[PDB]
């Protein structure tokens, strides 16, 4: 499975969650940012590694990072 990490520079804009085509990410309560919410990656067994989440992140440098890992049927995106 790929490795997805959220870093404390997140502003809780939710754009990574909206952009994920696999429903890997979600928003959870937080107190470290004005929005009082932080991105979370609870279901990384379904991440395909497309990095649409990274494309959507506004912070500099990124607050959501994907590290490509071992390949399974799910992570490879196979329908067979």
């Amino acid at each position: 499975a790929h490795i997805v990490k959220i870093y404390d520079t997140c502003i809780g804009c939710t754009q990574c969650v909206r952009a994920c085509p696999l429903d890997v990410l979600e928003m959870v309560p937080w107190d470290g940012c004005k929005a009082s919410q932080m991105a979370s990656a609870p279901r990384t067994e379904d991440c395909v590694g497309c990095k649409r989440c990274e494309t959507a992140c506004p912070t500099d440098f990124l607050s959501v990072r994907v590290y490509l890992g071992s390949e399974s049927t799910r992570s490879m995106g196979l329908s067979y």
Binding site: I6, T9, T14, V17, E26, M38, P42, V48, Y67, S79
Partner: protein, 144 residues
Amino acid sequence: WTVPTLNPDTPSPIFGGSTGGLLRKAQTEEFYVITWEAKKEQIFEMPTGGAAIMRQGPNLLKFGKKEQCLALTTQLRNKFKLTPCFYRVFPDGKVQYLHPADGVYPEKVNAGRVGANQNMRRIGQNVNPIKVKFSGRMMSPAEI
């Protein structure tokens, strides 16, 4: 809110079929089922190609991978204002409800969710690869 239970008897949208659907993986490994309630008969686009008509009321479709179910979910939500959900169905009959995980779609912050894979530092504060060398496998400094 409580986890819904899949009803296999649900009728499926009117559709003549295609060559883009399920393969042997569904019989042996797993497949996915998406269900939603339609306010009226309407034409939508299948993620596997072609046009289908959703029946008024309950609808049910089966797909070969999770991304296909969520791709149709995005279409139904944004273009028709519906609220679909889908499951993972194993060959032995087990059903695993998937989406939305807690009844609230992930883009909306909900109470009771526990953060996962959250590092309390910036990317620039990761250690050098030399510090995790010979840890038992290949691992990034972001994994610590």
